Amino acid sequence: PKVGRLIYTAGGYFRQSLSYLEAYNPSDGTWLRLADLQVPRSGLAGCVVGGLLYAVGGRNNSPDGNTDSSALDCYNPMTNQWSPCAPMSVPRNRIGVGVIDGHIYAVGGSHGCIHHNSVERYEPERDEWHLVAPMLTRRIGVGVAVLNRLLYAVGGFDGTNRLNSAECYYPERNEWRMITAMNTIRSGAGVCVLHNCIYAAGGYDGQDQLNSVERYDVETETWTFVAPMKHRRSALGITVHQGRIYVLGGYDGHTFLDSVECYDPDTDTWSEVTRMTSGRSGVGVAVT
Numbered sequence: 001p002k003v004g005r006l007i008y009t010a011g012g013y014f015r016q017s018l019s020y021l022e023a024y025n026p027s028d029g030t031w032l033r034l035a036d037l038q039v040p041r042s043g044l045a046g047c048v049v050g051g052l053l054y055a056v057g058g059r060n061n062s063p064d065g066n067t068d069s070s071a072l073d074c075y076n077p078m079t080n081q082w083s084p085c086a087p088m089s090v091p092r093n094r095i096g097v098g099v100i101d102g103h104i105y106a107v108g109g110s111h112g113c114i115h116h117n118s119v120e121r122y123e124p125e126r127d128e129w130h131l132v133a134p135m136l137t138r139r140i141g142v143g144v145a146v147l148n149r150l151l152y153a154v155g156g157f158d159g160t161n162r163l164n165s166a167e168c169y170y171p172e173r174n175e176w177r178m179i180t181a182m183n184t185i186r187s188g189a190g191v192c193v194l195h196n197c198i199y200a201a202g203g204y205d206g207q208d209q210l211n212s213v214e215r216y217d218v219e220t221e222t223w224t225f226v227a228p229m230k231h232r233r234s235a236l237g238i239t240v241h242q243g244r245i246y247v248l249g250g251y252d253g254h255t256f257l258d259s260v261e262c263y264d265p266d267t268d269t270w271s272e273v274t275r276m277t278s279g280r281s282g283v284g285v286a287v288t
């Protein structure tokens, strides 16, 4: 009879793309060092289906060059091992990922000079990827979250501009509809859902990296600012754990942060809760 349930951070960038997987335990402030990724990647995304952690997309900036990733890989906490899955139809660096009933949606991202609007869906039961309706906008550095079985694609960069627009995908209809635009332009923001709201934290606006955080209320169709983070960050990892938002690392324009913060909505306050064993940006985070 033991515990508990952890925040997994996979990959990222500091000096090069990274293979790190570490897991953070909020109940005691400890980090476990786990099996490396089969291949190092930054700007991947993380999610969790069926107890298993997945690492989607990204790119390997290495001494041997730059290779964008179409890869999907599955990590099992019980065996501390990673397995390849079927690859996506196109490489997707700086990708957003969302989960709906055990299906993983990969949105946007880039391969070289291509900025994707394409979106595709992964079915773990049968290990197959299927294309769905492309987004209305080309988006890399896109934040993605799921709320009442709708997928939201938020922020990003289209090839020319950094975006404050956002769009929502209806699976029943297989179509995308534009929602209210954010108050701020954000590419590389951390986006997640919590208590029936979509939060967008940090990112990059075309000039600076941001400390600011806004949330969208589906009922009112409005974005409202909340307390900002202590630190400015772009390419931060983000997740929810026990009624709380954690953000991990990111780049503030000088430094690759090891800072990890924690937002409590009931008090609307952020606090520093720990440090990653090293500073880094562009990680995939997820909880299981």
Ligand SMILES: Cc1ccc(S(=O)(=O)c2cnc(SCC(=O)Nc3ccccc3C(F)(F)F)[nH]c2=O)c(C)c1
Residues within 6 Å of the ligand: 094, 140, 141, 156, 157, 162, 187, 188, 203, 204, 206, 209, 234, 235, 251, 253
């Ligand atoms: C091609 C491209 C355009 C725009 C974005 S983007 O989403 O709009 C964005 C997000 N975050 C930043 S943080 C500041 C910074 O120095 N960037 C920088 C500096 C040197 C080399 C590469 C980059 C970076 F890949 F973009 F990071 N900057 C961006 O342009 C990104 C991620 C890539």
Ligand SMILES: Cc1ccc(S(=O)(=O)c2cnc(SCC(=O)Nc3ccccc3C(F)(F)F)[nH]c2=O)c(C)c1
Residues within 6 Å of the ligand: 012, 013, 042, 043, 044, 061, 094, 140, 141, 187, 188, 189, 234, 235, 251, 281, 282, 283
């Ligand atoms: C939206 C987004 C997604 C992912 C990332 S990221 O996954 O963190 C990443 C990092 N880096 C690169 S290019 C390699 C490079 O030299 N970076 C570098 C080197 C020195 C100083 C500053 C930077 C940079 F600001 F971080 F770019 N590309 C990324 O996607 C970033 C930076 C933004």
